[PDB]
Amino acid sequence: AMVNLENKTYVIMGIANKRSIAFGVAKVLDQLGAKLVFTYRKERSRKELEKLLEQLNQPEAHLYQIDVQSDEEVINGFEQIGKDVGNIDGVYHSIAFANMEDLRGRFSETSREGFLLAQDISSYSLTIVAHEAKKLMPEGGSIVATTYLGGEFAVQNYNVMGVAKASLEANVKYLALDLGPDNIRVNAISAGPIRTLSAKGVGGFNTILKEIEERAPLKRNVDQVEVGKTAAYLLSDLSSGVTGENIHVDSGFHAIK
Amino acid sequence: LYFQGAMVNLENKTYVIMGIANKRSIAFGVAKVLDQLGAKLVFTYRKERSRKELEKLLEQLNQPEAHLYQIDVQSDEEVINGFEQIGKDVGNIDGVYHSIAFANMEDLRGRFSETSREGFLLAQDISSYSLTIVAHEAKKLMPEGGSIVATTYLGGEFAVQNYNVMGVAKASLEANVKYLALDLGPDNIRVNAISAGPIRTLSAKGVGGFNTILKEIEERAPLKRNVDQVEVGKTAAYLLSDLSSGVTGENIHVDSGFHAIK
Amino acid sequence: MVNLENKTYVIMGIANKRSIAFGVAKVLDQLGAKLVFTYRKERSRKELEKLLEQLNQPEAHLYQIDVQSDEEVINGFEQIGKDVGNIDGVYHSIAFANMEDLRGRFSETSREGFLLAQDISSYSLTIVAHEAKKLMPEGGSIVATTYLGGEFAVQNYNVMGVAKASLEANVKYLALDLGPDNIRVNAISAGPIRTLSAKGVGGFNTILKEIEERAPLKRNVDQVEVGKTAAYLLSDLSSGVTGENIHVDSGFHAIK
Amino acid sequence: NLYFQGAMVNLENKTYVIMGIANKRSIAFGVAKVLDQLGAKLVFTYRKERSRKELEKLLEQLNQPEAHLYQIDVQSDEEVINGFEQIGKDVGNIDGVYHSIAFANMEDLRGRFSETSREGFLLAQDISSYSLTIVAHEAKKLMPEGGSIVATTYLGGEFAVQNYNVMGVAKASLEANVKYLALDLGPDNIRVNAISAGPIRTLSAKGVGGFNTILKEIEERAPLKRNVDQVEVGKTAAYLLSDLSSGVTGENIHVDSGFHAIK
Numbered sequence A: 001a002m003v004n005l006e007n008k009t010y011v012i013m014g015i016a017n018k019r020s021i022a023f024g025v026a027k028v029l030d031q032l033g034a035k036l037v038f039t040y041r042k043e044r045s046r047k048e049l050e051k052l053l054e055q056l057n058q059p060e061a062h063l064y065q066i067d068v069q070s071d072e073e074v075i076n077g078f079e080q081i082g083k084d085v086g087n088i089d090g091v092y093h094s095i096a097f098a099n100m101e102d103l104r105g106r107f108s109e110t111s112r113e114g115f116l117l118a119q120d121i122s123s124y125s126l127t128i129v130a131h132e133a134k135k136l137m138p139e140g141g142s143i144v145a146t147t148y149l150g151g152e153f154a155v156q157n158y159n160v161m162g163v164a165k166a167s168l169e170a171n172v173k174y175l176a177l178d179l180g181p182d183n184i185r186v187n188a189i190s191a192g193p194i195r196t197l198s199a200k201g202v203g204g205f206n207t208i209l210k211e212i213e214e215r216a217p218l219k220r221n222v223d224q225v226e227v228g229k230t231a232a233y234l235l236s237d238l239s240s241g242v243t244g245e246n247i248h249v250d251s252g253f254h255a256i257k
Numbered sequence B: 001l002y003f004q005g006a007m008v009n010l011e012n013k014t015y016v017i018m019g020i021a022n023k024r025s026i027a028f029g030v031a032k033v034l035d036q037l038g039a040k041l042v043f044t045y046r047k048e049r050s051r052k053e054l055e056k057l058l059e060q061l062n063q064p065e066a067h068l069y070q071i072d073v074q075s076d077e078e079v080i081n082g083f084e085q086i087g088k089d090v091g092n093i094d095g096v097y098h099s100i101a102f103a104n105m106e107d108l109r110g111r112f113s114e115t116s117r118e119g120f121l122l123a124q125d126i127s128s129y130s131l132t133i134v135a136h137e138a139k140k141l142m143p144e145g146g147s148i149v150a151t152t153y154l155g156g157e158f159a160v161q162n163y164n165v166m167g168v169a170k171a172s173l174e175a176n177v178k179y180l181a182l183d184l185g186p187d188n189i190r191v192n193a194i195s196a197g198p199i200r201t202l203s204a205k206g207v208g209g210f211n212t213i214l215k216e217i218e219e220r221a222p223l224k225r226n227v228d229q230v231e232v233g234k235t236a237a238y239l240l241s242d243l244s245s246g247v248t249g250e251n252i253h254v255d256s257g258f259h260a261i262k
Numbered sequence C: 001m002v003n004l005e006n007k008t009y010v011i012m013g014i015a016n017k018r019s020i021a022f023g024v025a026k027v028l029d030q031l032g033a034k035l036v037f038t039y040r041k042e043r044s045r046k047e048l049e050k051l052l053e054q055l056n057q058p059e060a061h062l063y064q065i066d067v068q069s070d071e072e073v074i075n076g077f078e079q080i081g082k083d084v085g086n087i088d089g090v091y092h093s094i095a096f097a098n099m100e101d102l103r104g105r106f107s108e109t110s111r112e113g114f115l116l117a118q119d120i121s122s123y124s125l126t127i128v129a130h131e132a133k134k135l136m137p138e139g140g141s142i143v144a145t146t147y148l149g150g151e152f153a154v155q156n157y158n159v160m161g162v163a164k165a166s167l168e169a170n171v172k173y174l175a176l177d178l179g180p181d182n183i184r185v186n187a188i189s190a191g192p193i194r195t196l197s198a199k200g201v202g203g204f205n206t207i208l209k210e211i212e213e214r215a216p217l218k219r220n221v222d223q224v225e226v227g228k229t230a231a232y233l234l235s236d237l238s239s240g241v242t243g244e245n246i247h248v249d250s251g252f253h254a255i256k
Numbered sequence D: 001n002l003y004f005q006g007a008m009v010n011l012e013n014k015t016y017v018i019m020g021i022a023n024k025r026s027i028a029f030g031v032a033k034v035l036d037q038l039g040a041k042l043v044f045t046y047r048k049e050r051s052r053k054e055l056e057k058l059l060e061q062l063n064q065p066e067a068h069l070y071q072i073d074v075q076s077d078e079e080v081i082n083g084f085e086q087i088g089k090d091v092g093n094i095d096g097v098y099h100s101i102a103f104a105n106m107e108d109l110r111g112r113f114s115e116t117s118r119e120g121f122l123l124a125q126d127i128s129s130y131s132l133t134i135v136a137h138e139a140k141k142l143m144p145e146g147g148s149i150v151a152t153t154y155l156g157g158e159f160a161v162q163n164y165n166v167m168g169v170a171k172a173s174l175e176a177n178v179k180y181l182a183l184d185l186g187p188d189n190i191r192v193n194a195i196s197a198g199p200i201r202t203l204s205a206k207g208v209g210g211f212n213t214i215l216k217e218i219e220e221r222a223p224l225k226r227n228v229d230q231v232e233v234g235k236t237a238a239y240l241l242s243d244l245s246s247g248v249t250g251e252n253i254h255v256d257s258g259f260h261a262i263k
């Protein structure tokens, strides 16, 4: 009951370049006729985002600088999206960070600084984004964050980022419980591994890809467009009965041991 | 871009739907969504006497032809000859929606420790094994791959008051879904479950525990409301189509978030 | 708290010196519990008796129970009650599946095979719990053995995997049912161990080889380690724990 | 024959460090009681200067030949590092650690979870989760033959529980922390596990919103139809800290009357 997203409006957070999971999301939602608003942190992502948008069908470029480490910029940014475009239907959250040092060494060796930075950027950011986005969804809508199986199970070399994704998945459940009575669904997609910018020189990544290929039920890896397709289902009314959920888009790998 | 692109378009696709009893059946919610989305639909039913009502029910869909097959999933021969006949009459298919379970009332009403052997094995057979043999037979009609979806309940994952023998059968079903996904994945067949919140169907009539948990969902669930058959139907169309192309071995909860809280 | 003298336990499913249940018995015997054993078939009893000569039981309490039969499970526990009195718990270490179903494709599983594995490996716990409850009027503890393949699709575990998923739910529903009777019901989820029922799985050494390489503890587990956790779960030490599944698997359950 | 009673758990010759006793109602004092009854040499850590003397009062309730107390605020690397280094010098090698430390700002707990402060979110994560990571790294220096580390969690780390809010996100992080430390430290023969306790009326639970209601719910709905206490957490701790749980690592044992298993 509802196959098109015309008249829908979504914010996409965390496109960095053509290989971003959030750009797969953007491409999909754009082909379904949604208006899209984009948020970036640093500059090279702006001059990039302007270039990538040329591939989309969007009749105007709504681009806002939000570093989610600043409550101010989150609060001001969403307030401004509100003034510029009005109410929205949902947010796609494609944002995380861990220090390379921490991931390279033993988990027991993780710095206090790296642990809290990963938490702040990869989990708390969803909390304050939801709180501010809600102000633009007076009738409800849908919030989707991106996670990885390493938040549910200890995965070799994922280390501090795993604890941050475990924190994130709890965040989704608690937000879902908090925001449900306001008609706002909150859900995660647990993407299988995908070769993005931030996957570059991560140890454990290439071998994890090969392992998926050999052992996952579908015997192949997933891509950004496949995440995008599940994101469209979660952000639309097709999943209207569905909240606090974590959909694995990972070729079945979560289901096997 | 001159046109609205569709998230799901099932024109020229064919799906087998098993387990429609009447208008309030979860599977009829599935049927209404898939029909509206353009699918050709094939229906199966347990007993000869149910055909007439089923066919009369069917007419309010937009199916330019009625495809109805008698299949009691207790009988290997009826499952095998049934899907064989479907193949001969309509061709290859894209998927199967499984909405079939049974547990004895006497077993359900007793204490779980008092469950009868006979009723335990009957619940396993109809509610779980039936997915295995339907998947084997339906695979023959899916030479390029497809999608199979079964219907389960949260009581397969946790002890829910009164759900008793049916909870054990649903746990067996959920694991059936995972092993089938692993077995059939290399053939491009995805196998998934929808864990539906409680819905007022024919089968829910007179089942102890049902109303208690329904009122609990309304009070405590994140959405503070119960789901309907059409919301199961919308999730079924996601799983059964290419919108869910990387997803297999999964159990999507359509239950207002109740699964997520304690 | 620390010694099980003056406790009594029924142990179901010792086959031979390599059975997980014999790990359990050695352990319980060492802690001074009185033990009562069940076995499936009569031609088996004499060689069970010789095995139990290695324990410190003064008296061989041995009862023949094939858990496919209501009547034998009923009369078996009746006899135990009349012969030894009340008990403090049961260790359930029984399972079966036809070997053919485990290394054909899962979608090819036969109906007869599927249900026989459900009957023996899962329903048996329910009826045993029901009859054992009669010997436990101030409460007690029942423990079943499971494997990770009841939680995730483990390659080739197939119909046993579905049976073990059935068993783990059976454990939770029993815990809820019998909790107000002060009876706790829990599972141990053992890592793979080289028992007699493991011979005949093709590639079993390669499976032990994955645990050694990848599990947090980088080693496989043994029958006596299962028994140590069994003693915890069968004693008052775990007095607040019911409906639980403890993995005794060198931490494999926790990694991906 | 056997001429003697085998012992499930004998802790004589074992030494354990216990972090997070505030007072008599602490979950960690219930742990202390059970380890001391079993013969363990215990070493205690505490947060403030001023709480020291009153902790020493508690101790004489125990069979300890001498008071080993070390001031350690887990927010400060130096104090954990120095604290363990000193324990090693004063006492020598150890057999495990029991971690019973958590904090969440009351103001955060009392708002809607969506209103949680950044400062409070990170403070919860630091004390309630990161602290396990650094304790493990330091304790391991005193565990060359290996040993056992246990942390204390709650079901609201696994499911959204009304009013647990930011502490629930912190327990989620802790439960992951536990799995990652299990994987990292397993080759060193160090096991790492959690106990997920049912609600217990401790000093920290006082003033906490949602607590009393859940206590009643447990008595009514849990399989054992009763609440657990601190000594019951202690006995499961003694299992996890000892060789009785050899082979068990990365696990979360629910000591909660079966409530986790129902819906």
Ligand SMILES: NC(=O)C1=CN([C@@H]2O[C@H](COP(=O)(O)OP(=O)(O)OC[C@H]3O[C@@H](n4cnc5c(N)ncnc54)[C@H](OP(=O)(O)O)[C@@H]3O)[C@@H](O)[C@H]2O)C=CC1
Residues within 6 Å of the ligand: A013, A014, A015, A016, A017, A019, A020, A021, A022, A040, A041, A042, A045, A066, A067, A068, A069, A093, A094, A095, A096, A097, A121, A146, A147, A148, A190, A191, A192, A193, A194, A195, A196, A197, A198, A199
């Ligand atoms: N790649 C994979 O295999 C998997 C990734 N994920 C998750 O998917 C999401 C997207 O990552 P991915 O596409 O891999 O790679 P990208 O590196 O393309 O995207 C990550 C984005 O996070 C942004 N970001 C980082 N810190 C901040 C901050 N302080 N404020 C605002 N934005 C910030 C980056 O912005 P900037 O322009 O500042 O770099 C970038 O746009 C993440 O949550 C990731 O953990 C989940 C499963 C697997």
Ligand SMILES: NC(=O)C1=CN([C@@H]2O[C@H](COP(=O)(O)OP(=O)(O)OC[C@H]3O[C@@H](n4cnc5c(N)ncnc54)[C@H](OP(=O)(O)O)[C@@H]3O)[C@@H](O)[C@H]2O)C=CC1
Residues within 6 Å of the ligand: B018, B019, B020, B021, B022, B024, B025, B026, B027, B045, B046, B047, B050, B071, B072, B073, B074, B098, B099, B100, B101, B102, B126, B151, B152, B153, B154, B195, B196, B197, B198, B199, B200, B201, B202, B203, B204
């Ligand atoms: N209602 C609810 O609250 C929930 C239901 N579910 C599940 O959804 C599915 C559909 O249930 P629901 O719509 O409630 O009930 P319905 O009674 O509407 O439909 C159940 C169907 O199963 C059929 N069936 C039973 N035994 C057999 C058999 N041997 N061979 C073939 N078909 C058989 C019934 O046939 P007949 O009428 O001929 O006997 C009927 O068509 C079931 O798996 C159920 O467990 C899951 C979660 C919650």
Ligand SMILES: NC(=O)C1=CN([C@@H]2O[C@H](COP(=O)(O)OP(=O)(O)OC[C@H]3O[C@@H](n4cnc5c(N)ncnc54)[C@H](OP(=O)(O)O)[C@@H]3O)[C@@H](O)[C@H]2O)C=CC1
Residues within 6 Å of the ligand: C013, C014, C015, C016, C018, C019, C020, C021, C039, C040, C041, C044, C065, C066, C067, C068, C092, C093, C094, C095, C096, C120, C145, C146, C147, C189, C190, C191, C192, C193, C194, C195, C196, C197, C198
């Ligand atoms: N070995 C392993 O790797 C693992 C085993 N498990 C589980 O541990 C338990 C013990 O297995 P294990 O020790 O390996 O193997 P064993 O073969 O030693 O023991 C299994 C026992 O079950 C008995 N049994 C089978 N059918 C019946 C029946 N109808 N009535 C009564 N008893 C019956 C067998 O009887 P008989 O002697 O007549 O054959 C045998 O004594 C099982 O539940 C198993 O699935 C769990 C994790 C891994």
Ligand SMILES: NC(=O)C1=CN([C@@H]2O[C@H](COP(=O)(O)OP(=O)(O)OC[C@H]3O[C@@H](n4cnc5c(N)ncnc54)[C@H](OP(=O)(O)O)[C@@H]3O)[C@@H](O)[C@H]2O)C=CC1
Residues within 6 Å of the ligand: D020, D021, D022, D023, D025, D026, D027, D028, D046, D047, D048, D051, D072, D073, D074, D075, D099, D100, D101, D102, D103, D127, D152, D153, D154, D196, D197, D198, D199, D200, D201, D202, D203, D204, D205
């Ligand atoms: N009570 C319950 O219902 C449940 C509690 N838990 C968990 O059990 C554990 C113990 O809780 P509980 O016994 O209730 O309450 P307590 O209040 O007795 O214990 C909490 C302890 O943590 C110490 N602590 C806090 N911050 C620091 C810090 N910066 N450095 C060092 N120590 C610090 C406190 O010190 P101080 O006195 O200096 O403030 C106090 O001793 C916690 O992890 C809690 O989350 C789990 C499930 C349920």
Ligand SMILES: Cc1c(N)cccc1Cn1ccc(OCCc2cccs2)cc1=O
Residues within 6 Å of the ligand: A096, A097, A098, A099, A148, A150, A155, A156, A157, A158, A161, A192, A193, A194, A198, A199, A202, A203, A204, A205, A208
């Ligand atoms: C944003 C970011 C940063 N800053 C550092 C490391 C990783 C990531 C994002 N990312 C990237 C890759 C990924 O792959 C999961 C598969 C792996 C397993 C172990 C290590 S990688 C998951 C994932 O979360």
Ligand SMILES: Cc1c(N)cccc1Cn1ccc(OCCc2cccs2)cc1=O
Residues within 6 Å of the ligand: B101, B102, B103, B104, B153, B155, B160, B161, B162, B163, B166, B197, B198, B199, B203, B204, B207, B208, B209, B210, B213
């Ligand atoms: C087909 C069938 C039969 N023969 C017997 C009982 C139940 C069902 C179908 N059904 C119906 C309702 C349902 O409700 C879930 C909520 C409940 C909780 C406890 C009891 S019912 C789940 C569910 O599976």
Ligand SMILES: Cc1c(N)cccc1Cn1ccc(OCCc2cccs2)cc1=O
Residues within 6 Å of the ligand: C095, C096, C097, C098, C099, C102, C147, C149, C154, C155, C156, C157, C160, C191, C192, C193, C197, C198, C201, C207
């Ligand atoms: C009693 C029985 C029968 N009749 C048939 C198969 C297996 C068993 C017992 N067993 C034996 C081995 C085992 O190993 C787990 C690891 C495996 C993975 C895939 C196949 S085995 C688990 C396990 O359950």
Ligand SMILES: Cc1c(N)cccc1Cn1ccc(OCCc2cccs2)cc1=O
Residues within 6 Å of the ligand: D102, D103, D104, D105, D109, D154, D156, D161, D162, D163, D164, D167, D198, D199, D200, D204, D205, D208, D209, D210, D211, D214
């Ligand atoms: C140390 C601390 C601080 N500083 C603040 C809040 C909670 C706690 C410890 N605590 C205390 C009680 C508790 O009870 C679990 C039951 C609950 C459910 C909802 C609210 S309480 C869990 C729990 O973790």
Ligand SMILES: [Cl-]
Residues within 6 Å of the ligand: none
């Ligand atoms: Cl009939």
